[PDB]
Design a binder for this molecule. Structure first.
Ligand code: IMP
Length: 358
């Protein structure tokens, strides 16, 4: 593009410098990046959302955000607490009569939400593919560790939290999210189920073999990893986590998601969000989002006392997302890609960029 005026945004060089090497090293088809600094949103877009249409990524493009969905599910659960429909210390079986008589008689909602129920696995067994089979699974599940003693990152765990929280509010999860929570957060281009008039904005994800894919139906997918959103809407969620929102209950719920429950190394587990003392070393950020913390059971330690960085990774077969923000400095970044590229690469880039914004 020799001879064209280069974009005027003073932040473009900093973002490009971190993001462009990323796109070529890991062959990422497209990425939407959004940055907050000094009360203003900046969007930087790269590549293609859909190789069939050849359409470019924009801040309106919908990506699967995988486990970043857990921050929204956590916020819904916090909302149920604010509204008085449940408490984090409730036994899970209080919100599900079909759980009475199982181990979930003695496991709290809080423990489900923070993956510390006692060894619930990362994914459901592949056999569990219906509501009836799901219920049977939980009723037979044998705890591996005592409640609260270990963190084992788990979709069945946070998934069950979201499900029972919606049930305490007497509405199914997806309509509760789409009709109550998301609008109150000002996320009007965010969906559990992408409707027809929004399907055109929905990117394709691309596998390692560069085949187009989107997330597969699974049990509690909505609760655990099912949100589609744009970079602009996710940046709005970041702003909601910094400056707040007009709905008073939703305001409280947001604050509740920031409260620490326990730590693993330098990472403190909140509801959905994971947090760090800021400024934070790259090695600490890397460690808290490492395979060790993600895949294996880790003992819970005392939470960090209440400047803080909040983050959450999210991945599906075809997508890779990351969000991090620092309320005390009014900075944040959202990175949404349609390839599942390594978590370490996301953190290194985000960390580099945030440091410049600060
Ligand atoms: O079932 C699994 N087995 C092994 N790794 C997984 C599984 N599910 C997700 N992951 C990976 O675990 C990491 C954390 O996922 P995230 O929290 O959704 O970003 C990502 O690298 C995922 O691709």
């Amino acid at each position: 593009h020799h001879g064209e005026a280069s974009p005027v945004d003073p932040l473009r060089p900093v973002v490009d410098a971190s993001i462009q090497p990323l796109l070529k090293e890991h062959r990422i088809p497209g990425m939407a990046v959004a940055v907050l600094k000094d009360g203003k949103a900046h969007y930087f877009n790269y590549g293609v959302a859909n190789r069939e249409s050849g359409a470019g990524v924009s801040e309106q493009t919908l990506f699967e955000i995988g486990s970043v969905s857990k921050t929204l599910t956590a916020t819904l659960g916090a909302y149920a607490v604010v509204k008085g429909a449940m408490q984090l210390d409730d036994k899970a079986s209080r919100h599900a009569p079909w759980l009475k008589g199982s181990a979930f008689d003695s496991i709290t909602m809080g423990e489900l939400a923070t993956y510390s129920a006692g060894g619930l696995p990362l994914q459901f067994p592949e056999e569990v593919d219906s509501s009836e089979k799901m219920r049977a699974y939980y009723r037979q599940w044998a705890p591996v560790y005592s409640p609260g003693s270990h963190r084992q990152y788990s979709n069945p765990s946070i998934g069950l939290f979201g499900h029972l929280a919606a049930s305490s509010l007497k509405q199914p999860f997806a309509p509760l999210m789409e009709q109550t929570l998301l609008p109150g957060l000002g996320m009007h281009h965010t969906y559990v189920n992408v409707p027809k008039q929004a399907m055109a904005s929905y990117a394709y994800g691309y596998s390692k073999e560069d085949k187009p894919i989107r997330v597969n139906p699974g049990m509690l997918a909505d609760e655990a990893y099912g949100i589609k959103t744009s970079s602009a809407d996710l940046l709005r969620f970041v702003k909601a986590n910094i400056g707040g929102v007009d709905d008073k209950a939703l305001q409280q719920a947001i604050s509740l998601t920031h409260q620490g429950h326990y730590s693993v190394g330098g990472m403190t587990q909140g509801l959905g969000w994971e947090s760090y003392a800021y400024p934070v070393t790259e090695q600490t950020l890397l460690a808290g989002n490492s395979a060790k913390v993600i895949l294996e059971a880790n003992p819970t330690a005392a939470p960090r006392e209440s400047q803080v960085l909040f983050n959450k990774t999210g991945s599906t077969n075809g997508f890779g997302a990351y969000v991090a923000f620092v309320p005390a400095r009014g900075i944040g970044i959202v990175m949404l890609a349609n390839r599942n590229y390594p978590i370490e690469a996301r953190i290194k880039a985000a960390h580099a960029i945030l440091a410049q914004l600060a």
